[PDB]
Automatic annotation (TrEMBL), chain A:
Residues 4-15 have a biased composition (Basic residues). The chain holds residues 27 to 76 of 76 of the full protein. This is 60S ribosomal protein L39. It comes from Triticum urartu (Red wild einkorn). Keywords: Ribonucleoprotein, Ribosomal protein. One of its GO terms (molecular function) is structural constituent of ribosome. The gene is LOC125524779. It comes from the Eukaryota.
Automatic annotation (TrEMBL), chain C:
Belongs to the eukaryotic ribosomal protein eL13 family. It comes from the Eukaryota. It comes from Triticum aestivum. Keywords: Ribonucleoprotein, Ribosomal protein. This is 60S ribosomal protein L13. GO terms for cellular component: cytosolic large ribosomal subunit. GO terms for molecular function: RNA binding; structural constituent of ribosome. The gene is LOC123131777. GO terms for biological process: translation.
Automatic annotation (TrEMBL), chain E:
The gene is LOC123151875. GO terms for biological process: maturation of LSU-rRNA. GO terms for cellular component: cytosolic large ribosomal subunit. Residues 63-153 form the Ribosomal protein eL8/eL30/eS12/Gadd45 domain. This is 60S ribosomal protein L7a. The chain holds residues 53 to 207 of 258 of the full protein. It comes from Triticum aestivum. Keywords: Ribonucleoprotein, Ribosomal protein. GO terms for molecular function: RNA binding. Belongs to the eukaryotic ribosomal protein eL8 family. Component of the ribosome.
UniProtKB/TrEMBL annotation, chain F:
One of its GO terms (cellular component) is ribonucleoprotein complex. This is Large ribosomal subunit protein uL23 N-terminal domain-containing protein. The lineage of its organism: Eukaryota, Viridiplantae, Streptophyta, Embryophyta, Tracheophyta. It comes from the Eukaryota. The gene is LOC123189664. Belongs to the universal ribosomal protein uL23 family. GO terms for biological process: response to high light intensity; translation. GO terms for molecular function: rRNA binding; structural constituent of ribosome. Binds to 23S rRNA. Keywords: Ribonucleoprotein, Ribosomal protein, RNA-binding, rRNA-binding. Residues 7-27 are annotated as: Disordered. Part of the 50S ribosomal subunit. Signal peptide: none annotated. The chain holds residues 37 to 152 of 152 of the full protein. It comes from Triticum aestivum (Wheat).
Amino acid sequence: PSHKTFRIKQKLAKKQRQNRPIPYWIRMRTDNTIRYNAKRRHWRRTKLGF
Amino acid sequence: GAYKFVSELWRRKQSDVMRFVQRVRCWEYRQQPAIVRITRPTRPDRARRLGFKAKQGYVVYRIRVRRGGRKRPVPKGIVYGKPKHQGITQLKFQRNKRSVAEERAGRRLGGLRVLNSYWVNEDSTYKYFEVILVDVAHSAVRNDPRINWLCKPVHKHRELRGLTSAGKKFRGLRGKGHRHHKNRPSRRATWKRNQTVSLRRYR
Amino acid sequence: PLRPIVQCQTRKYNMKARAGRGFTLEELKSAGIPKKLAPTIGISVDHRRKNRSLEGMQSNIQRLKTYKAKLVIFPRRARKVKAGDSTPEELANATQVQGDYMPI
Amino acid sequence: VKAGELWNKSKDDLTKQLAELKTELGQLRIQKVASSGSKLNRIHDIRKSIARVLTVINAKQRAQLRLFYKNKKYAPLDLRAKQTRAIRRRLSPDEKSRVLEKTKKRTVHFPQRKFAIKA
Amino acid sequence: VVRIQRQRRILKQRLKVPPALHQFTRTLDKNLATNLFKMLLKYRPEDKAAKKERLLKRAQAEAEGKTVEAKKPIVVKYGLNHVTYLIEQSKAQLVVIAHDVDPIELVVWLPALCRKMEVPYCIVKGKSRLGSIVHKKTASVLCLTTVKNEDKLEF
Amino acid sequence: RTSVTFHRPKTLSKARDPKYPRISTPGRNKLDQYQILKYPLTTESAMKKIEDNNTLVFIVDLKADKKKIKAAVKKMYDIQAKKVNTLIRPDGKKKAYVKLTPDYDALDVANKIGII
RNA sequence: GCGCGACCCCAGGUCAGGCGGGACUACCGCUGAGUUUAAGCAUAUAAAUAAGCGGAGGAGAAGAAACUUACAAGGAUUCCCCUAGUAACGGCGAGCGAACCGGGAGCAGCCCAGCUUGAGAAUCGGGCGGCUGUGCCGUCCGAAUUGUAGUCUGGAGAGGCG
RNA sequence: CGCCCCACGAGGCGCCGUCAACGAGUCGGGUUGUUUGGGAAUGCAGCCCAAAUCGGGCGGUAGACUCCGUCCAAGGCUAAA
RNA sequence: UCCCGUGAACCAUCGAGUCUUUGAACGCAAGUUGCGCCCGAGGCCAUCCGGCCGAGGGCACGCCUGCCUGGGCGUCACGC
Ligand SMILES: [Mg+2]
Ligand SMILES: [Mg+2]
Ligand SMILES: [Mg+2]
Ligand SMILES: [Mg+2]
Ligand SMILES: [Mg+2]
Ligand SMILES: [Mg+2]
Ligand SMILES: [Mg+2]
Ligand SMILES: [Mg+2]
Ligand SMILES: [Mg+2]
Ligand SMILES: [Mg+2]
Ligand SMILES: [Mg+2]
């Protein structure tokens, strides 16, 4: 909706930031296991359910 | 000493004088809420012998409860099961009404602790009990050694947990020999004990 | 604390003596030891038992006398030695007996 | 600036240093968005220095007010001792030591005497 | 609250009060009650401010004199238990019962006890007015055990 | 009585007179000017706004409102705002457009802070 | 045209204070099934259990005989072994099933109400003040005589003599 | 280890014989329901009846009489295993 | 300068502090950053020596002890 409540706007703000590739310098960091962001979300595939 | 006089006069509960005063008190009680603060015991002797004192922090609250048995709350009297659990109308609650009154006053009165409760008046539909409550944050109770034992944390909601006079009566703790050996420490404790399969190491 | 020689119940074990719970009031009185003081100095008291036999009473009275014979009691204070106390010279060798000190 | 010297200041000087540090924090966030390289780390230092100077403000203030109300007056809730709710609702040792008159007599008389055997 | 307390007196009028309770509402007359209360006012107990001085001025007699010079004061006795003990030991010369004690069972048995231990008893009107005699809020019973030699006839 | 209805009489109550304040410390102003104006946004869009509309574009605290935004832009920068508009960006931060009175020049203010 | 006292009940953002919710191993109270077994099934069994609803603590509960026994009797509570798969209970079918005695672990017994200062509430709380500060003390109010403190608890006790 | 010294109050012990006070819609009984190993009814609970003071509860088969063994409920606190 | 010292550290540890919106959640509600009421440090001008803008902070429910203001011929004594 274009008329979204502030709660939903605030909580859709965070799921914006939650969707970015890992910083490249995470991969070179010692004793690391992070291979990619295994929690990405695409808007056509996974609906946030709210 | 007057308490012997008044106690015997309350022993004679079918006399004309007690019938009069008890009917008029029953009407007055029936015209008030179920749980009502009352300033002083109507039965000073009975209150005293159970540990009431004319001291700050001991309050008296009159509690009303309905009479009759506990009729099973199922949606139309339909109890899905074998015929031997299928009754409704002649089941009896396994806590006495004295305890029910204590467990009403205890819930509504959070900040106070239930000491005892005693019968005051009765009619066809309602029993009236007077519950003695104790205020354990009150300094005059903190400084009385005979009642400090009630300020320790292990005596929370005695009424809700089955520890008062009515509590022990309906728990069947009034008795020690046979006829009462299963109820020590509790019926569930003895059931657990008798059901534990003891497998010793060198069995 | 000290425990009395008593008989068991029950035809199966009537003849077999065992340690009881405490000395009766009659026994404490006749051995000359006050009611409220007996539990103080290591002597149990069982106000619920009844003495039905001289055979039992003198049997336990000999135990009370033996215990008082080989009992030592420290003073409640350091220098003040009141009645019922014991002298320092034999207080100084006192030990902790271990196990059953009066077998039945 | 260091804390050993930062406690040893006056109230006005300490808040004035707070103000200057906060303005510096403002200008470092100014240059965060435009420039970079070498001043981008001073923001960490200025932030921690804000933390130091506010901690000094608050610690010194609450110490002073502990002194002021610690004439054993009524103490406020933010100053009373929080340990746990059970601890606050226990009885003080005098309250626990309350024992009845008959028992006080029974402990004056008839104490637990000290004994051994084989005497 | 008002409604039930008015219906209270209405119901106590309607119902048949038994003789034991109906002995109340038959109180000592106005003139006789006032005349008796004159004397009960003469023989009031000791105040608190008036009780501090009696113990504070014996200081010289206890610290220095080492003697007790005080005598027996004569006051009215009160309290249900104390007065019942006195009446059963027959050291009561007169008993004053408040008509309006709630619960009434505290004073129902008094008249028979008084009568059959042969003690003069009256049921005056006003437990608060009795309480004033002894400075408590409610008294519910009083008694005279002794009077000064200058007031025997009028007692 | 005249009316046959009984109403609760007008009693007298006291205002609170605590014997000890339930809070001792004075609460510090956590929405001070520096938390309420985090930093001027310097994207090309706000850059063009600076000259075309004489407005400075800030990122401001999410609990700020137009009243505090003007009051704060007055204490900092020694300026005043003729008007202020606020929106909440999708990223979460609130963005505020502060339009100056024409006595004050946005280029001069933005050069005295350093944006261009 | 009243001023009084008591009772009972109001409203107070009055002063000072205690309540509510969370965790589930263990613990206390209520409520409370059936699948299953009986080669069917309906009492019984599953089970005085699972689920439901509440309440606490470091343990909880019980506890100082209105006990068991029939003995030469013992002697609070709790737990282990034995009693005992026994007495008993059961469409006497399936099954179910404790206790006393005894041996051990540990053992501690206590306090109220009532007749009992009546030359005299000796008791307790609160405000304020002091100090030595988990309290003590002074003063002023209040609670309380419809009984606070003290003595007493059946093993006793109260009195009187030593 | 040191200073502080324990009473006319309380207790214990011995005797006396006078008092000797002890918990009520509670026990207890009928009937119903549940539960138990508890069987003419093991506890509990509802309703009705409802006390006793030379008495009351037990002694595992209901009943009345005689005797005997035993305990004192209807208030409260209490570690240890 | 953080290096033979008021002293580094994604160090350890814990007593001095901070602890956003909520939630038993407590001003009223809540698909609402919704709608209130009271105190008030501080400043303005003086329509007075009052009012405006406030930093902050309160305002829930039953309950106890006490205190205040009250109600009812419920019981009364004294009075016009
Ligand atoms: Mg907008
Ligand atoms: Mg089958
Ligand atoms: Mg089959
Ligand atoms: Mg089938
Ligand atoms: Mg369950
Ligand atoms: Mg316990
Ligand atoms: Mg065998
Ligand atoms: Mg079974
Ligand atoms: Mg059931
Ligand atoms: Mg039955
Ligand atoms: Mg207990």
